[PDB]
Amino acid sequence: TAELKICRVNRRSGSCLGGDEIFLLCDKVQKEDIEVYFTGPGWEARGSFSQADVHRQVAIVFRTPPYADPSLQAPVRVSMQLRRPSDRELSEPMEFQYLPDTDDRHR
Amino acid sequence: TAELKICRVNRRSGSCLGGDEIFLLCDKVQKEDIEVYFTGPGWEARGSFSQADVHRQVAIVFRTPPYADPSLQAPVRVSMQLRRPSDRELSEPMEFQYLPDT
């Protein structure tokens, strides 16, 4: 609320299958102690990135996690937050919208 | 006095009509002395942004300028570079391709 803070992002929606690249500008974080936490009723997931994807402590380029439901029929809004494992500190939540998508290989 | 460096970008192409948002992660820059240039034979234009768009001296979020031809039929290659207006220093160039809008 006073430390962890999301300042700006390149996109606020993406495929329910995950895998979209997100550029997130934030206040100073520690690459070894930071994560991007997605949440919804009874569901939680984390963005995928390496410590090398944290740029000068103030930006993170990561890939969205897949949503709980790949058969999503209509868009669904979830929360996205920076989370610090060490002390469980969380930034204020930002809205992220998962969108229907189809994988020809998955029926 | 130091050097300009483009570290990572969200996209390396966009419409010839301009207006695409680019996230550019770079080495330390001064928000009051930094620009992003697009250059090609007989053409040059700057990325559009304000000092507020320079995040903690290491990232710039800007809009691409319209290319010289708003009706491209095929891709055109130009260079995108960081540029300091005070002394006109430039970063190594990154290939950027303007594309047909249609």
UniProtKB/Swiss-Prot annotation, chain B:
PTM Phosphothreonine: at which residues?
T64
Deletion phenotype: RELA haploinsufficient mice show cutaneous ulceration, epidermal skin loss and a predominance of neutrophils and macrophages in the dermis and hypodermis in response to TNF treatment.
Residues bearing PTM Phosphoserine: S86, S91
Compartment(s): Nucleus; Cytoplasm
Q: How is it modified after translation?
A: Ubiquitinated by MKRN2, leading to its proteasomal degradation. Degradation is required for termination of NF-kappa-B response. Polyubiquitinated via 'Lys-29'-linked ubiquitin; leading to lysosomal degradation.
Q: Which residues carry this modification: N6-acetyllysine?
A: K28, K31
Q: What is known about its induction? A: Induced in myocardial tissue by lipopolysaccharide-induced myocarditis.
Which tissues does it occur in?
Answer: Expressed in the myocardium (at protein level).
According to the UniProt entry, the note on domains is: The transcriptional activation domain 3/TA3 does not participate in the direct transcriptional activity of RELA but is involved in the control by RELA of the accessibility of target gene promoters. Mediates interaction with ZBTB7A. The transcriptional activation domain 1/TA1 and the transcriptional activation domain 2/TA2 have direct transcriptional activation properties. The 9aaTAD motif found within the transcriptional activation domain 2 is a conserved motif present in a large number of transcription factors that is required for their transcriptional transactivation activity.
Quaternary structure, from the entry: Component of the NF-kappa-B p65-p50 complex. Component of the NF-kappa-B p65-c-Rel complex. Homodimer; component of the NF-kappa-B p65-p65 complex. Component of the NF-kappa-B p65-p52 complex. May interact with ETHE1. Binds TLE5 and TLE1. Interacts with TP53BP2. Binds to and is phosphorylated by the activated form of either RPS6KA4 or RPS6KA5. Interacts with ING4 and this interaction may be indirect. Interacts with CARM1, USP48 and UNC5CL. Interacts with IRAK1BP1. Interacts with NFKBIA. Interacts with GSK3B. Interacts with NFKBIB. Interacts with NFKBIE. Interacts with NFKBIZ.
What this chain does, per the entry, is described as:
NF-kappa-B is a pleiotropic transcription factor present in almost all cell types and is the endpoint of a series of signal transduction events that are initiated by a vast array of stimuli related to many biological processes such as inflammation, immunity, differentiation, cell growth, tumorigenesis and apoptosis. NF-kappa-B is a homo- or heterodimeric complex formed by the Rel-like domain-containing proteins RELA/p65, RELB, NFKB1/p105, NFKB1/p50, REL and NFKB2/p52. The heterodimeric RELA-NFKB1 complex appears to be most abundant one.
For this entry, the protein name equals Transcription factor p65
> What is the protein's species of origin?
Mus musculus (Mouse)
Chain's gene name: Rela
Span of the entire protein shown here: 191 to 292 of 549
